């Protein structure tokens, strides 16, 4: 809690969970990042930008590649199609 | 060839350039029309966003964000707002005349807004298949306006506009069962005649 | 009572997931709620209700001592009966 409560005030902290030996729970493929953008570029997404000027929010998210596709992190190569 | 015209007749209906009325109740933000389509520079990115507008009512106040010349001018709630002025101000123009907000943006682009819901963008002879979105491609062919963002024609428009939402994680709309009577006129044959 | 799927956007309330965590946004009504995986309610609320609200999360004023004003309105020292 203390992490977020400071973060809300306008001053965020970084990497504190690295040595704390406690990470908040998240499903497979993701673990807790800090200050990920809400507009997670997913798999079946339109490539538009500079509308998501929202503030930055903490939470768990995929690795660098491994785009989101239906609640899991899957590699960008295997983005399916839909019909 | 003349100057075509999108439209939003009512809350959830859409008329294409080539002319194709179709039904699409949405609640997310959607790409009405743009230029960034396939193999193009992508000058303008007119968007539209409705809220509480799957069922038409006194709700469904629209929001419109139009993205041209690296600017951010948008409108809703009666007035227009400049969030980011664009570079070439010379082409910019606003004509608040009568009931409308006539709004030019260039040589071959113009927007009209009834202050309430309607969005009637007007494009010139310039493009001729250089755009895509919910209004189709502006090619003259009238039965290829449902070419989804994944580059295939779809038969069912409710799946189409789902392909054109911006936030790719919001709620896509629901395939409604087809009938001649909306919710109120459903099994309300009396009212159904008076409305008729 | 009817279990619905997710996401869900009726009546101006977008019920979405963000960063693997569930969100409920009421921006028209000026709030954002969410939950994490472990279960930790959080409410981001707009300054429009400055000095107005009163509930279990206290009033949105500046002070942090007076925000036990009961459903009648009574500054109660106890954080429990409140
Ligand atoms: C809160 O409202 C009360 C009653 O109207 C008023 O007396 C008081 O000055 C207000 N305080 C703040 C911090 O706005
Ligand atoms: Ca066409
Ligand atoms: Ca307080």
């Amino acid at each position: 809690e203390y992490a977020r409560t400071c973060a809300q005030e306008g001053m965020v902290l970084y990497g504190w969970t690295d040595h704390s030996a406690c990470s908040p729970v998240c499903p497979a493929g993701m673990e807790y990042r800090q200050c990920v953008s809400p507009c997670a570029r997913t798999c079946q997404s339109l490539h538009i930008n500079e509308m998501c000027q929202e503030r930055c929010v903490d939470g768990c998210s995929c690795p660098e590649g491994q785009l989101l596709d239906e609640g899991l992190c899957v590699e960008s190569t295997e983005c399916p199609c839909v019909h | 060839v003349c100057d075509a015209t999108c439209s939003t007749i009512g809350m959830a209906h859409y008329l294409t350039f080539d002319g194709l009325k179709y039904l699409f109740p949405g609640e997310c933000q959607y790409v009405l029309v743009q230029d960034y389509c396939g193999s193009n520079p992508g000058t303008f990115r007119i968007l539209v966003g409705n809220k509480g507008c799957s069922h038409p009512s006194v709700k469904c106040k629209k929001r419109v964000t139009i993205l041209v010349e690296g600017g951010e001018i948008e409108l809703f709630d009666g007035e227009v707002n400049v969030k980011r002025p664009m570079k070439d101000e010379t082409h910019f123009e606003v004509v608040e005349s009568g009931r409308y907000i006539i709004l030019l943006l260039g040589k071959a682009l113009s927007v009209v807004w009834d202050r309430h819901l309607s969005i009637s963008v007007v494009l010139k002879q310039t493009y001729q298949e250089k755009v895509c979105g919910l209004c189709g491609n502006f090619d003259g062919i009238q039965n290829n306006d449902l070419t989804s963002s994944n580059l295939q024609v779809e038969e069912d428009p409710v799946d189409f506009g789902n392909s054109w939402k911006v936030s790719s994680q919001c709620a896509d709309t629901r395939k409604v069962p087809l009938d001649s009577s909306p919710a109120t006129c459903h099994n309300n044959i009396m009212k159904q005649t008076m409305v008729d | 009572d009817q279990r619905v799927s997710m996401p869900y956007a009726s009546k101006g309330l977008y019920l979405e997931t963000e960063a693997g965590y569930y969100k409920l946004s009421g921006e028209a009504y000026g709030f954002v709620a969410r939950i994490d995986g472990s279960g930790n309610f959080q409410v981001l609320l707009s300054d429009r209700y400055f000095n107005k609200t009163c509930g279990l999360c206290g009033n949105f004023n500046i002070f942090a001592e007076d925000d036990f004003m009961t459903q009648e309105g009574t500054l109660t020292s106890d954080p429990y009966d409140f």
Side-chain angles (χ1 to χ4, degrees), chain A residues 2-40 42-83, chain B residues 1-60 62-196, chain C:
Chain A
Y2 182 76
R4 291 189 296 272
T5 59
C6 180
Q8 189 273 329
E9 294 292 328
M11 182 270 168
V12 65
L13 73 163
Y14 293 98
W16 62 268
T17 186
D18 191 359
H19 65 279
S20 178
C22 181
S23 66
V25 64
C26 282
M30 297 182 285
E31 64 279 16
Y32 182 75
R33 284 85 172 91
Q34 190 285 127
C35 185
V36 65
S37 177
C39 297
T42 185
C43 171
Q44 293 179 356
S45 66
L46 190 151
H47 295 89
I48 189 164
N49 59 2
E50 61 91 21
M51 60 80 68
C52 187
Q53 297 294 320
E54 294 177 354
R55 292 184 291 113
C56 187
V57 176
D58 60 354
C60 50
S61 297
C62 292
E64 183 61 25
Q66 292 81 16
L67 294 174
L68 189 151
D69 191 358
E70 297 295 329
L72 60 85
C73 303
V74 64
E75 183 60 25
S76 179
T77 301
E78 293 80 1
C79 264
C81 302
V82 64
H83 180 72
Chain B
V1 64
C2 299
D3 297 332
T5 300
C6 298
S7 179
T8 301
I9 299 91
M11 289 70 165
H13 293 90
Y14 293 99
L15 183 63
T16 60
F17 294 104
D18 296 327
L20 181 62
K21 182 173 73 68
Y22 63 93
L23 182 63
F24 182 76
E27 293 179 353
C28 294
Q29 185 176 3
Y30 293 97
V31 176
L32 182 62
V33 64
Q34 64 183 356
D35 193 0
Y36 182 75
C37 187
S39 66
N40 291 318
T43 60
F44 63 91
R45 292 181 182 177
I46 296 168
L47 279 72
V48 64
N50 59 2
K51 66 182 290 295
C53 193
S54 66
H55 295 285
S57 66
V58 299
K59 185 172 71 173
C60 178
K62 298 290 180 70
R63 183 176 292 170
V64 176
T65 61
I66 60 170
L67 281 72
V68 66
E69 292 182 355
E72 183 67 27
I73 189 169
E74 62 87 18
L75 60 85
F76 62 93
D77 192 359
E79 294 295 328
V80 64
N81 296 115
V82 177
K83 298 296 291 182
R84 296 179 65 252
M86 65 184 180
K87 293 181 181 180
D88 190 357
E89 182 63 25
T90 61
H91 294 88
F92 183 76
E93 179 65 24
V94 176
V95 176
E96 182 176 1
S97 66
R99 184 174 63 83
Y100 288 166
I101 302 300
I102 297 91
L103 189 152
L104 283 72
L105 295 171
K107 183 175 174 66
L109 184 62
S110 296
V111 176
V112 176
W113 181 59
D114 63 356
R115 186 175 291 171
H116 188 268
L117 295 173
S118 69
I119 301 299
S120 178
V121 64
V122 176
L123 281 71
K124 298 293 184 182
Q125 189 269 327
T126 302
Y127 294 94
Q128 295 294 114
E129 186 174 1
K130 297 295 291 182
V131 297
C132 62
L134 294 174
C135 292
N137 59 5
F138 182 74
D139 64 358
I141 301 299
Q142 190 269 328
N143 60 4
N144 60 359
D145 289 330
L146 293 175
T147 61
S148 63
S149 296
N150 61 4
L151 277 295
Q152 64 185 354
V153 176
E154 292 181 354
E155 69 278 15
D156 195 359
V158 65
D159 292 330
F160 180 75
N162 289 318
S163 64
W164 293 97
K165 65 177 72 65
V166 177
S167 66
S168 179
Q169 62 87 31
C170 66
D172 59 356
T173 185
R174 179 71 273 172
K175 296 185 287 292
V176 65
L178 282 72
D179 61 356
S180 66
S181 66
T184 306
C185 290
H186 182 73
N187 295 117
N188 189 358
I189 190 166
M190 182 277 289
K191 184 261 180 66
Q192 158 58 79
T193 60
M194 293 181 182
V195 63
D196 189 359
Chain C
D1 59 356
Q2 296 295 321
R3 186 177 64 247
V4 298
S5 67
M6 182 180 71
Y8 182 77
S10 295
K11 268 61 187 298
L13 295 174
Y14 294 97
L15 182 63
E16 295 176 356
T17 185
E18 294 294 328
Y21 291 165
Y22 296 163
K23 181 175 74 174
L24 189 152
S25 67
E27 294 178 354
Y29 294 97
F31 64 92
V32 176
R34 60 90 55 80
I35 61 170
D36 61 354
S38 66
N40 290 317
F41 294 167
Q42 183 177 2
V43 176
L44 296 173
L45 188 150
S46 179
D47 58 357
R48 186 175 65 247
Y49 293 99
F50 181 78
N51 192 14
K52 267 64 187 295
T53 185
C54 62
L56 185 63
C57 297
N59 57 5
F60 185 71
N61 59 358
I62 302 299
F63 292 166
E65 68 280 16
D66 60 354
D67 59 357
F68 293 161
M69 296 294 174
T70 58
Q71 184 172 355
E72 293 184 356
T74 60
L75 74 164
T76 60
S77 66
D78 188 0
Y80 182 76
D81 63 359
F82 180 76

